[PDB]
Design a protein around this ligand. Structure first.
Ligand SMILES: C[C@H]1CCC[C@H](O)CCC/C=C/c2cc(O)cc(O)c2C(=O)O1
Ligand SMILES: C[C@H]1CCC[C@H](O)CCC/C=C/c2cc(O)cc(O)c2C(=O)O1
Lengths: 9, 237, 244, 9
């Protein structure tokens, strides 16, 4: 999921 | 947890510093508004605001202490409430209008451009009016926004206990702000209640906004980005 | 208006005395549940609870001071929130179950007898757990329920003019209920810091109750269109007020 | 409305 990736960025 | 270790002044400073910027919209005055073009402007703006929100959230004391799944859950539940409280705050000094962006200031009549939208505009305007009536402070606003983040999805989960400890800390912070502002002890709990009761209205508006967004999707009014589709899908309408 | 002149103890007494009765279901315990039967029992109960709710509202201090139109508006906005907080209160000492009525105590898995119901059951059960975790008192409960009545629709009118007298009055009454909550906590021996924290904890639950009501209203609306169950005229009007 | 009538009883 995108939000999951964005939270690590 | 450094969060639980912060003083009231430190909590306020951290929150004020984490504040995202006011963004501009893709508004082009060369074309008339349509339902589709207004929705396009708004969804594009939301998309941009969401990226800044995600990074703001990471700076809210306590938030990064959670697992990625819990972070995802809280943001998924609260994203539209957070966008809305920000809009209402921006719009305080513009009675009768919503300051979506500095180059996108809309009144209720322009809201009518989109089916079902004016009803939501009206609630947001009434909320902005309430903020004015209360003389909501910037320091109070940022506490409220962080409360929304931590609270909205908390009842849909030790992690919970940690969240409630952070929430209590923000309550202490709000009280501290009101006391420093010269409010009497009685005025302190009265105002605290008035502020927190607004959050019920913000939840309501978010729920109606989610139904509205779902309707726009189901009628193919505007292409939603993958992020927005997933944020919307989280609410399983 | 007697409302603004009531003491904390007088407010609590008024609210305790105004409390509606706990109704029984017509549920026949010898017969298994079907989706239609359960929804029939629940809608029947909701209809009977609503009639008592209307009498209770009239006894909430400050409510009858409002125009009939404003009274209607508040009840139309808050009715399902009010039913739900009452249900959560009833179920507090029954972990994992919802006491719709003394003879209709449904556990988490029985919500599955109805399409889309289990999700609502789960939210309601989480609220009762929260209440249990906080040790919510009966005196606090009645304050919270009255706050829901006065608060939920208060921004969806005051809308001038010149009925700003309505809004300001309602907010004055809301302050009096806040005073009453804090009074109960002080009486219970909580420190000032613990009072403010607990007040916030209680009021934040109202956000979750709003959420549940909105989801509940969508479920009810879908039950209407699926014609799964005939709904009373009162129930249909309360539903239509939310114009889904 | 029914609610209007009940609030007057
Ligand atoms: C008026 C409201 C309509 C929400 C449902 C709309 O369907 C949601 C999509 C449009 C988003 C609007 C929006 C964008 C933004 O960046 C910030 C906001 O506070 C909003 C917002 O409040 O939109
Ligand atoms: C579980 C929830 C489902 C609501 C949607 C349902 O579609 C609403 C109709 C069923 C009514 C349930 C109900 C009745 C009542 O007397 C008290 C209540 O708290 C409820 C209630 O919370 O119903």
């Amino acid at each position: 999921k995108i939000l999951h990736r964005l939270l690590q960025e | 947890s450094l969060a639980l270790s912060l003083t009231a002044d430190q909590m306020v400073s951290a929150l004020l510093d984490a504040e995202p910027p006011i963004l501009y919209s893709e508004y082009d005055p060369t074309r008339p508004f349509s339902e589709a073009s207004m929705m396009g402007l708004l969804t594009n703006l939301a998309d941009r605001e969401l990226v800044h929100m995600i990074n703001w959230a990471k700076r809210v004391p306590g938030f990064v202490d959670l697992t990625l799944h819990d972070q995802v859950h809280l943001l998924e539940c609260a994203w539209l409430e957070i966008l809305m409280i920000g809009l209402v705050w921006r719009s305080m000094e513009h009675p009768g209008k919503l300051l979506f962006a500095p180059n996108l200031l809309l009144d209720r009549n322009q809201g009518k451009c989109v089916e079902g939208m004016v009803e939501i505009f009206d609630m947001l305007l009434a909320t902005s009016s309430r903020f004015r009536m209360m003389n909501l402070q910037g320091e109070e606003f940022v506490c409220l926004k962080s409360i929304i983040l931590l609270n909205s999805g908390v009842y849909t989960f030790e992690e919970k206990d940690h969240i409630h400890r952070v929430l209590d800390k923000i309550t202490d912070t709000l009280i501290h702000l009101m006391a420093k502002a010269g409010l009497t002890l009685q005025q302190q709990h009265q105002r605290l209640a008035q502020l927190l009761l607004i959050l019920s209205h913000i939840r309501h508006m978010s729920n109606k906004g989610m139904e509205h967004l779902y309707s726009m999707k189901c009628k193919n009014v505007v292409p939603l980005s993958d992020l927005l589709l997933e944020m919307l899908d989280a609410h399983r309408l």
